[PDB]
Amino acid sequence: MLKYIIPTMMLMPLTWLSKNSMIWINTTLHSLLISLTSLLLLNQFGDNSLNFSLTFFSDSLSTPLLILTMWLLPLMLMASQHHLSKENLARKKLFISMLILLQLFLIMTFTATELIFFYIMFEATLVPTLIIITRWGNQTERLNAGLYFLFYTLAGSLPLLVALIYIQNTMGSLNFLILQYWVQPMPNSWSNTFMWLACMMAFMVKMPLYGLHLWLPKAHVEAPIAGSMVLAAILLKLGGYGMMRITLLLNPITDFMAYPFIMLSLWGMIMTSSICLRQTDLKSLIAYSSVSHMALVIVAILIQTPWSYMGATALMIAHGLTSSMLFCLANSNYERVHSRTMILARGLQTLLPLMAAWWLLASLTNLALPPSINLIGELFVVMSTFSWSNITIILMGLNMVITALYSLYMLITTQRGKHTHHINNILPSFTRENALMSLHMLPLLLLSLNPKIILGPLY
Amino acid sequence: GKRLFIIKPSGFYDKRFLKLLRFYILLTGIPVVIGITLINVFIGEAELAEIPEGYVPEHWEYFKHPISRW
Amino acid sequence: MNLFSSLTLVTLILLTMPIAAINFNTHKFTNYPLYVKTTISCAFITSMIPTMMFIHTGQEMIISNWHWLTIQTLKLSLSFKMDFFSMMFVPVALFVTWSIMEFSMWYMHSD
Amino acid sequence: AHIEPRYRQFPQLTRSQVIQAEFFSATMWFWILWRFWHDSDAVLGHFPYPDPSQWTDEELGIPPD
Amino acid sequence: STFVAYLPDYRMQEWARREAERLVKYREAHGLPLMESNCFDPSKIQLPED
Amino acid sequence: ITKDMLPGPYPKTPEERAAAAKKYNMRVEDYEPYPDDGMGYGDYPKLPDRSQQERDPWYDWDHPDLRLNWGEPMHWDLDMYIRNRVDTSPTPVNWNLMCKHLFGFVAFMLFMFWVGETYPTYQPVGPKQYPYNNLYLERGGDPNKEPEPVVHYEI
Amino acid sequence: SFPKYEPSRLASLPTTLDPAEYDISSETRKAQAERLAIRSRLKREYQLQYNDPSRRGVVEDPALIRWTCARSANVYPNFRPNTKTSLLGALFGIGPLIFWYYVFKTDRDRKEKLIQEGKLDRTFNISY
Amino acid sequence: SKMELPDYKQWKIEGTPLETVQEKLAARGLRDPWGRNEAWRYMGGFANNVSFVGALLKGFKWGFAAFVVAVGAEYYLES
Amino acid sequence: AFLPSAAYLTHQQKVLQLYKRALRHLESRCVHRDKYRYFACLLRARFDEHKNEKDMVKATQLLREAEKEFWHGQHPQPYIFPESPGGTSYERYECYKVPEWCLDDWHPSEKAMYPDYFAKREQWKKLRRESWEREVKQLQEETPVGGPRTEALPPARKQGDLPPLWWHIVTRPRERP
Amino acid sequence: HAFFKAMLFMCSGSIIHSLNDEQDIRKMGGLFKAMPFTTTALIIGSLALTGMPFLTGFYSKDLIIESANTSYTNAWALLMTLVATSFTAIYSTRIIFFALLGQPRFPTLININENNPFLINSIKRLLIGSLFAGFIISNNIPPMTIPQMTMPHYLKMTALTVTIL
Amino acid sequence: RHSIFAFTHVLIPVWIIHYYLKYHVTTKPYTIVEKKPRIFPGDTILETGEVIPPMKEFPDQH
Amino acid sequence: SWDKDVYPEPPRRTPAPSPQTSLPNPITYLTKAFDLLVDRPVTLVREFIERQHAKNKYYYYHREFRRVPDITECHEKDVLCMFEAEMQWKRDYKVDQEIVNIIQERLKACQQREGESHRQNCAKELQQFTQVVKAYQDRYHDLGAHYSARKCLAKQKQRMLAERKATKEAA
Amino acid sequence: DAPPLTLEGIKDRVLYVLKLYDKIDPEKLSVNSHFMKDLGLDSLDQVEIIMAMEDEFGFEIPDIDAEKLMCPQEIVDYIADKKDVYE
Amino acid sequence: GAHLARRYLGDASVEPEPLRMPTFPPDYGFPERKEREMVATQQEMNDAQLVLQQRDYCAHYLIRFLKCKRDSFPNFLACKHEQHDWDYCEHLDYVKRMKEFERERRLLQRKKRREQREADMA
Numbered sequence A: 001m002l003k004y005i006i007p008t009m010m011l012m013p014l015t016w017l018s019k020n021s022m023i024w025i026n027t028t029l030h031s032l033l034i035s036l037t038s039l040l041l042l043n044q045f046g047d048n049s050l051n052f053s054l055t056f057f058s059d060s061l062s063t064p065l066l067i068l069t070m071w072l073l074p075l076m077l078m079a080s081q082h083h084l085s086k087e088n089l090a091r092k093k094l095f096i097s098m099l100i101l102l103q104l105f106l107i108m109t110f111t112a113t114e115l116i117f118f119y120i121m122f123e124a125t126l127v128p129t130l131i132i133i134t135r136w137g138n139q140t141e142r143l144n145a146g147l148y149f150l151f152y153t154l155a156g157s158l159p160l161l162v163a164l165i166y167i168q169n170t171m172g173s174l175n176f177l178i179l180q181y182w183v184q185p186m187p188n189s190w191s192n193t194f195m196w197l198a199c200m201m202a203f204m205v206k207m208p209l210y211g212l213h214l215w216l217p218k219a220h221v222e223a224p225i226a227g228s229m230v231l232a233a234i235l236l237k238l239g240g241y242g243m244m245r246i247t248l249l250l251n252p253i254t255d256f257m258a259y260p261f262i263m264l265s266l267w268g269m270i271m272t273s274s275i276c277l278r279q280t281d282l283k284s285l286i287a288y289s290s291v292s293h294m295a296l297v298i299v300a301i302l303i304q305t306p307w308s309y310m311g312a313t314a315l316m317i318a319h320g321l322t323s324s325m326l327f328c329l330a331n332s333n334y335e336r337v338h339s340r341t342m343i344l345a346r347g348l349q350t351l352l353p354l355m356a357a358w359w360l361l362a363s364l365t366n367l368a369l370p371p372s373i374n375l376i377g378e379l380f381v382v383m384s385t386f387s388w389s390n391i392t393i394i395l396m397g398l399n400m401v402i403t404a405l406y407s408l409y410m411l412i413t414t415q416r417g418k419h420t421h422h423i424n425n426i427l428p429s430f431t432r433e434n435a436l437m438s439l440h441m442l443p444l445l446l447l448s449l450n451p452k453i454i455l456g457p458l459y
Numbered sequence B: 001g002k003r004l005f006i007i008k009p010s011g012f013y014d015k016r017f018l019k020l021l022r023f024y025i026l027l028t029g030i031p032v033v034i035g036i037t038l039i040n041v042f043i044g045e046a047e048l049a050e051i052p053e054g055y056v057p058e059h060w061e062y063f064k065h066p067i068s069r070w
Numbered sequence C: 001m002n003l004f005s006s007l008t009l010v011t012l013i014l015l016t017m018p019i020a021a022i023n024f025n026t027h028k029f030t031n032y033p034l035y036v037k038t039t040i041s042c043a044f045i046t047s048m049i050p051t052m053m054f055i056h057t058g059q060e061m062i063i064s065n066w067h068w069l070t071i072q073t074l075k076l077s078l079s080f081k082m083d084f085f086s087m088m089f090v091p092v093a094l095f096v097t098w099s100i101m102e103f104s105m106w107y108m109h110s111d
Numbered sequence D: 001a002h003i004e005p006r007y008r009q010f011p012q013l014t015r016s017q018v019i020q021a022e023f024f025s026a027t028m029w030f031w032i033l034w035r036f037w038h039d040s041d042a043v044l045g046h047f048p049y050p051d052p053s054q055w056t057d058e059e060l061g062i063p064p065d
Numbered sequence E: 001s002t003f004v005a006y007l008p009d010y011r012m013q014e015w016a017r018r019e020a021e022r023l024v025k026y027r028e029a030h031g032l033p034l035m036e037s038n039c040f041d042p043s044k045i046q047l048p049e050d
Numbered sequence F: 001i002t003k004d005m006l007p008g009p010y011p012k013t014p015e016e017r018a019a020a021a022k023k024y025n026m027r028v029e030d031y032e033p034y035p036d037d038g039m040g041y042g043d044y045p046k047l048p049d050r051s052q053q054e055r056d057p058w059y060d061w062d063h064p065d066l067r068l069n070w071g072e073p074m075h076w077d078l079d080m081y082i083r084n085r086v087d088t089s090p091t092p093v094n095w096n097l098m099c100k101h102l103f104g105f106v107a108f109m110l111f112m113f114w115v116g117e118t119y120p121t122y123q124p125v126g127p128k129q130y131p132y133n134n135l136y137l138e139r140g141g142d143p144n145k146e147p148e149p150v151v152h153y154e155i
Numbered sequence G: 001s002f003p004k005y006e007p008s009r010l011a012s013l014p015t016t017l018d019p020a021e022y023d024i025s026s027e028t029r030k031a032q033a034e035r036l037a038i039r040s041r042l043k044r045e046y047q048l049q050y051n052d053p054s055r056r057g058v059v060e061d062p063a064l065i066r067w068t069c070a071r072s073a074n075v076y077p078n079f080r081p082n083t084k085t086s087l088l089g090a091l092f093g094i095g096p097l098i099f100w101y102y103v104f105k106t107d108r109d110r111k112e113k114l115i116q117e118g119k120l121d122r123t124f125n126i127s128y
Numbered sequence H: 001s002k003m004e005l006p007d008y009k010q011w012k013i014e015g016t017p018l019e020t021v022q023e024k025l026a027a028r029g030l031r032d033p034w035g036r037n038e039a040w041r042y043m044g045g046f047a048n049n050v051s052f053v054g055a056l057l058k059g060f061k062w063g064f065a066a067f068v069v070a071v072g073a074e075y076y077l078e079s
Numbered sequence I: 001a002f003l004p005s006a007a008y009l010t011h012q013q014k015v016l017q018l019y020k021r022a023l024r025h026l027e028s029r030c031v032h033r034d035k036y037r038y039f040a041c042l043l044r045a046r047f048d049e050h051k052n053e054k055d056m057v058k059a060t061q062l063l064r065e066a067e068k069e070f071w072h073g074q075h076p077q078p079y080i081f082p083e084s085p086g087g088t089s090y091e092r093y094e095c096y097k098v099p100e101w102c103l104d105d106w107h108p109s110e111k112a113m114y115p116d117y118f119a120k121r122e123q124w125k126k127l128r129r130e131s132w133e134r135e136v137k138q139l140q141e142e143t144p145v146g147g148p149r150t151e152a153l154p155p156a157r158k159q160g161d162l163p164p165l166w167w168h169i170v171t172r173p174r175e176r177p
Numbered sequence J: 001h002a003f004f005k006a007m008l009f010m011c012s013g014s015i016i017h018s019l020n021d022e023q024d025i026r027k028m029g030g031l032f033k034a035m036p037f038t039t040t041a042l043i044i045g046s047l048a049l050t051g052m053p054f055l056t057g058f059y060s061k062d063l064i065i066e067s068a069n070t071s072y073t074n075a076w077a078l079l080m081t082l083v084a085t086s087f088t089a090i091y092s093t094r095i096i097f098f099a100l101l102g103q104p105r106f107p108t109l110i111n112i113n114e115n116n117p118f119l120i121n122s123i124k125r126l127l128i129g130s131l132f133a134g135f136i137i138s139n140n141i142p143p144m145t146i147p148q149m150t151m152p153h154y155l156k157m158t159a160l161t162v163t164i165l
Numbered sequence K: 001r002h003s004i005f006a007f008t009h010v011l012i013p014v015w016i017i018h019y020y021l022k023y024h025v026t027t028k029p030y031t032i033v034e035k036k037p038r039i040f041p042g043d044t045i046l047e048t049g050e051v052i053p054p055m056k057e058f059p060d061q062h
Numbered sequence L: 001s002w003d004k005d006v007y008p009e010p011p012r013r014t015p016a017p018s019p020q021t022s023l024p025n026p027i028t029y030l031t032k033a034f035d036l037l038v039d040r041p042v043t044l045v046r047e048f049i050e051r052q053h054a055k056n057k058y059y060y061y062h063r064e065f066r067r068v069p070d071i072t073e074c075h076e077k078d079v080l081c082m083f084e085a086e087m088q089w090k091r092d093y094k095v096d097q098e099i100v101n102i103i104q105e106r107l108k109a110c111q112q113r114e115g116e117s118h119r120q121n122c123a124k125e126l127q128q129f130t131q132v133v134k135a136y137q138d139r140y141h142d143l144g145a146h147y148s149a150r151k152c153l154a155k156q157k158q159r160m161l162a163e164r165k166a167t168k169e170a171a
Numbered sequence M: 001d002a003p004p005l006t007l008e009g010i011k012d013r014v015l016y017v018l019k020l021y022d023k024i025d026p027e028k029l030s031v032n033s034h035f036m037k038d039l040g041l042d043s044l045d046q047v048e049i050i051m052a053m054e055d056e057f058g059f060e061i062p063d064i065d066a067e068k069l070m071c072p073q074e075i076v077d078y079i080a081d082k083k084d085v086y087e
Numbered sequence N: 001g002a003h004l005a006r007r008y009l010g011d012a013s014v015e016p017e018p019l020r021m022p023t024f025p026p027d028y029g030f031p032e033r034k035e036r037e038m039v040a041t042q043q044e045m046n047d048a049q050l051v052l053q054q055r056d057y058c059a060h061y062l063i064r065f066l067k068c069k070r071d072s073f074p075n076f077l078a079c080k081h082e083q084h085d086w087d088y089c090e091h092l093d094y095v096k097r098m099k100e101f102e103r104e105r106r107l108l109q110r111k112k113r114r115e116q117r118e119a120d121m122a
Ligand SMILES: *C(=O)CCCCCCCCCCCCC
Pocket: F121, F122, J069, J078, J154, J155, J158, N001, N002, N003, N004
């Protein structure tokens, strides 16, 4: 993984040496070139992981997340290059520097061979997201959201540090391959109870688990578009990848331990979805949709069945792409109408036909329309949970209503009806926005043909 | 007759975006599909054969399509 | 075998090609509903012929023509099942949809 | 030309729709009358339903008792 | 799309099918049952005596 | 925007209520805040809980779809009462009469279906007589074992 | 005679059956005049801000921002923990959770007990 | 474009059931103020509409004649 | 109740509204024209029975009982005109009523194929931007203390002056685009 | 069912467009002779809906009635099936009586016109389909099950008696 | 240029699908499964040439 | 092509078409027109492509793996050989899943081929399918999402212990 | 389909519907005639006449607008502004 | 349909239950009864691909009608006589089933009369 870290460390002076008018083009070109070279990680096997050295390895689980991350960064640079056109050159270069550092941090975190390196890199991902949220955010109370995000993450992750150092001192190592070959069963003791809690609560915080999800409806709203995308499409999957790695080490206690937590999602993803039925802020609606999808991911990972794992990773990738596209749509509409109120801008189909088509495609991919990746993942999760127990189909099936009952609702109020009279600054669609949304959407429809590369490590 | 001007939003921008998107997709889609069909027709696929005694093939010889072998 | 499978698959492909034709369009079409109505009628004939051969013989089949997924022990493939129900339902729906082409061409001319 | 509008009177009708409607009504009546003269079974009665209680005792195997 | 359409026989999965094309061909020739119910040889297993 | 044009706490004395009514641009008598149950409604007034369909559509509104004027202080639950959602328009029949009629109708039909399931109808004929021991071999029975043969005779 | 309209929570009384509409008192007249004047002033402000040729943008609606801030950010500063809110939080916040946990624990215990005694039909279940 | 209306003298109250309604009202002591406006609906081509049995038996005569001709042709063509 | 110009509905307006709604519901319940005409004459006679009244309270609960009887004898599914709200064709082509200001966002390539219409639109825009100042000057002085009491707007007074706030009514979209 | 239901809806849409989008049947009538082809299509569609013998519906609907009585079935289900058949006949002739028969009720501007080749050819194709496709399908499908033949006379005329009543 | 619509839409997909089925679909096993045809007593088989014997003598009822 | 033993097919028996009516069947003329219009040019194109293939021929081979001692002949916490044993066990798992796929394809092909006589003419396929899924459930089921050769070895030891107490309680 | 209407045809049709009324005479009926002042009718006659034109032209005129349609020229004006004449 | 009245509204101890019928041995008052004969051999009736519900005693006419449907294409109405023959055979089978029903009813009535004789005699 030293063939990708050094290109980002060379991208850093590439955005610190360009002119004031050529930073965006050079950064976009070189990040797209790195995204093109990112496909060499697909040399995987059905039984072995692709190991490069003692510190970096990549199986069939971290590879789609890596590809999504360094495909999302050029999209981030496109999405955040208009509302920062009034900023200072030094602050613009600092913004690009934070984005490049965040991408480097993510691609170093996703390939961490040993778990302590993953933990320190996982906490190191806090700094640029917090800086972006508390600096380039628009609303007044963004400091509260940044403090809530940082403290939820740290209060989750410090018992994770204590448990990881305890495990390393107890058995001898934290390599994932060695722990795959030196695993030991954990008996049903209260020490193992608190060990499971310390190893899990950080990832339940960053997923987020229902009950501890309160850092999402704030930090997803007042943040800018790039911070919203990096919060919605990567870091939750970072927590999911960490939980997937950790849950190997905590058998067979989880079989009688994960009863509340699973069900803390198995009801929560109902009522949070109901919150999307009564939301006046579109970005909060997208954030709560992300909460519901991550609760489904929590259930799939915690029941630890194979089909659940495949559904979890497929829904992870599909929901990340869909939520990034929806956040870009919300940002474009907010730029056009200067308000985040959903009830304000109405009848946008009569003025913006192509944007209405993109809205329709994004809403259809959000409600798991087959044969998209989201339907594949959610269907695999439903099969696995029905294998777990019968009655839980109800707890999924009613969600099958409510998701549609908000998503098409989000499609209706913003697009269908008589248009607003006093709003007369709706410009035609920018080519930048259309390019960004096509770059969001077309990879999903292309991966719908060949999903076998994003179905997990055990396909 | 009595033709009335149908008031409509400006349709130049979306049509230009779709045209240039189709152009930039096809400008590389046509040569790569021409190369693919020329590989399929002229170079052709592989043939399955049993391993001879005393031969240790390279890894790319364990695959069929020439693009996959490359 | 040769006539039946080819004719059913080209019925499907004939019905699905105007979507790509209109998605790869630059200019304004000259009677696009007329073109789609001709496509519907030709697909009706191309689907009525294997229906006639099934009435003559009694031949049913299943074609798994694209290996899509091999997920764990389950195999998912693009499979078309031509049996009695599909055989005697497809031409009826295509004829009704042909009449719907003609009536919608007359009806929505002001739209 | 087309059919010109009229005010509080019967609209002008050409020959084509009238002869089409008359021919189709005649075709329907001819078809139903021909199928009633040919088959006459599915509507009026196909097979003689025998009376259940009129069967003779010696062929149904009940001894005289 | 060209690259992902032409991965070199991904995860050896297609190869596994070819291996299956050999294996049952073996086990339909010598009269062996189709698939043993024990993954390892039972003669090399020492159960804990009780 | 400014701080004193925004909602605050629950007013208690008359002059705070008058200031709230001035801010919410209603009369001092038509301003009825929610009761102080500690739920978080604040000083938001209680509209008479009517759908937007109840408003006259022939009136010229600033927002014709929502039937709401500009700056009109909307309901606390306006998103519940939009024209694509829950309505409160009057019905030709009473609501309780509607509910008891529907419940009695469905209960009577379900009881009729129950008593018809208990009391079936049929044609006074015998069973379908099948060959080959009631088709044992064609039903998946093992040919190596010979079950008890049934034999169907003339009548 | 006639069947009198009984209003409910989802069936409002008709406007023409209201006795208060049939009141010709002076106080109702000044109330109607005052609300008409308020509505006329707001309408005049709206169409003054609406027909301006120089303005090209969003006419700010204070009522919409007021409603959004009352719905979103002004719910916690005006909250007092009392017995009613505590009872409604205990009935709706943890009740469904413990009910669902109990029914699922019972079902999973029954399924595990049936499986471990070898009675459940799991012959063709090889996907899990 | 511009359509020329016919004369208004032709719309008379008679020839309708409207005059029966009017005389029953006069028996109770009222008068009909809109006889002429509704008099167009019962005068002209719309007068004496067929009953339902006439609607069901549309085209029965020619259908029966063609049925007789066809059954005679198939009766004489069997020999 | 809720009217743009008046703050209340008088007795005459209530009686006429009840009469019109009763005639509509009676026409719905009496589908054939002759039965409808006969019962409309009967209803007009019933309304003219109590036309000449001198006590306001007697008219008040007579109207109350008449409205109660009309509520009892209404059609559950009254006839609604297609363009009226609640009809099948209500606000349908409102989906195609694109506002005129979007024409200000057109490309110069697609603005060159309608030269004369856009020149006339430029003239209309100039007329609006030269009439706005005198229309707001007219509306400022004519407005009394406390704002206007009614929603009615004053008309054009001086010669050469356009009525105040006229753009979004004169340039409203057509019914059939 | 598909053929004559498409016919009925499509002729209804022709009538709706011919009368300026007036959809209520209480503002109708007098269309028996103003729309001859549409009246013929609507009458044939209603007759196929009711179960008029030797039409398309008679080749399916009446047959299921012959299987709805001589079977080990629920009594109340068959009872409301027959009552539903009577109700179908009732509302079909109700639509015939209100829309086609009677006297005109539309506004005084008459714009009745159907002389368009697309509509005429399309409804003609659906009319030929409703005339003969039921016979073709009922006589061309392979025999999949055993039809009921020996069954009494009072059960034989049940569908026709219910329709006539 | 009168019959383009019956050639550029029909015959070229017929050739493409026929080739793709003849040399890419039916080559792989069990992709296309055909039901065996109906055989009646007294029929003749082209592949074997053995004619089916006729059925039993009918105990006629009418 | 495919090996006939791994995907068996009973030989087809197509009847001779015996005409009894004077009306000529149009399906024969349709097949003749199809063979005159479609079969010949496609066959010519395939022959040309086969000539171009036969101009330049190259070979590809099927990879094989030798036998390593499995997980039961490995010292605990000894990675350098038990890793190979786990590797071979995962390869055997993939091959065995493909074997189950082959049996499922055989069963479905038998059902579709025999049609309405599937209850009688496919007893062998269903019996072999039942046997292979019983053995598959006895080998790999209930392992979990983090399965390894140690878990399968423990499950096999548990099953053999249950068999031992079964024969001890029956004697 | 849907033929256009001209304002001359609008007043011709309105005067045609007015001239068939039995409480009116076809002699002093003009296009600038007040219904109660210059013609002498009732308010019940006014609302019933408004309902007659509502049935004639096939759309509903609201009561708030219906109370002010007081002369045939004003009815023609309301129909003209509703139906977008002289295009 | 008076059998429903005789079974439900009257007494249920004399009318047969179609779920369990016949309840009496076949050899009751029937000296040397005959067995109904198959005509179609089970292999010939199996390779004709008949549905299991259609595989009753009269499958030979079904085989003949299917063969006539196959050979007389496209004249689908050419040989309806074989269809009439198969329908007649099905009608005869239904007649035999109804005769079995009447025999069971008469035997149950005779059993009731025998128990009535026992009650009024012993
Ligand atoms: C006794 O009645 C046997 C017939 C079948 C059971 C009764 C069926 C009743 C409904 C169908 C006949 C309706 C006659 C008007």
